[model samples]
Target: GPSNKIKCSHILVSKQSEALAIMEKLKSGEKFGKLAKELSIDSGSAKKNGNLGYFTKGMMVKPFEDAAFKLQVGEVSEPIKSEFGYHIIKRFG
Candidate 1:
């Protein structure tokens, strides 16, 4: 099961613009955790630097799970649209 699990982090926001802004910040060298803590609407994970710990397929909503699972460790995904909101995902391990 662990082999099938992946560690990830994300900053969730209610709008695409916000998600895009966050991506720019990341590109400009801003810390992902700092931005997540400040702007993520998912407060619980925001406080933990957006860390989602680990999960396997069928755990997250479809869009998020697909994007997350496609990433390699240390890779950050582009903004992903989902029912909850826009997620800027990063694969940790």
Candidate 2:
């Protein structure tokens, strides 16, 4: 398998309203990892600054893996709905 290096960040919002608020923050240029650590419900990655480390296709949940894989380096996706809630994803290579 080929490996790609990605730098990304996300916001985890349990509610639609909060998700929108976080989206606003993202649009305003707030750093993704900083916001993730401060606001994400996923404490495990939040502490590591949202570092998921290297992953391969199918290694993550469908929604998450799909979104992350679709992203191009330095590109952030629109909020994606998943079991965990809404996420704004950025991927880099």
Candidate 3:
């Protein structure tokens, strides 16, 4: 799995409804990073526009990792809930 890395970004919000709101913005042409910058609660990643850089299969939490790896490049996922919050995931690789 050493070479099984992928790039991604996400916006983590406290509420599923808020996550759904962000999804609506995405559907209407709002940029993912811009929304992430404005709304993500994970401050470290939020500063970088939610960019998680590159990661392999087991690097993330179960639900987030599962959803992230399944995405195609430039593909965005619906809200995925984890212990921290609901994640709006986007794959870049």
User: Which ranking of candidates, highest TM-score first?
Assistant: 3, 1, 2
Off by over 4 Å in 1: none
Candidate 2 has which clashing residue pairs, if any? 73-92
The digit string of per-residue lDDT tens for model 2 on 1-93 reads 746545555667677666566556667777667667766677776796665656667656777777776777766666677888887666645
**CA lDDT for candidate 1:** 0.81
Residue 70 lDDT (model 1): 89
- lDDT tens string, model 3, 5-91? 888888889888877787687788888888788779997877999988888777778879888878888888878888878888888
**Lowest-sum lDDT 10-residue window in model 1:** 1-10
Better of 1 and 2 by TM-score: 1
Regions of candidate 2 where Cα sits further than 4 Å from its true position: 1-7, 20-23
State the C-alpha lDDT per candidate. Answer: 0.81, 0.67, 0.82
State which candidate has the highest TM-score: 3
C-alpha lDDT of candidate 2 relative to the true structure:
0.67
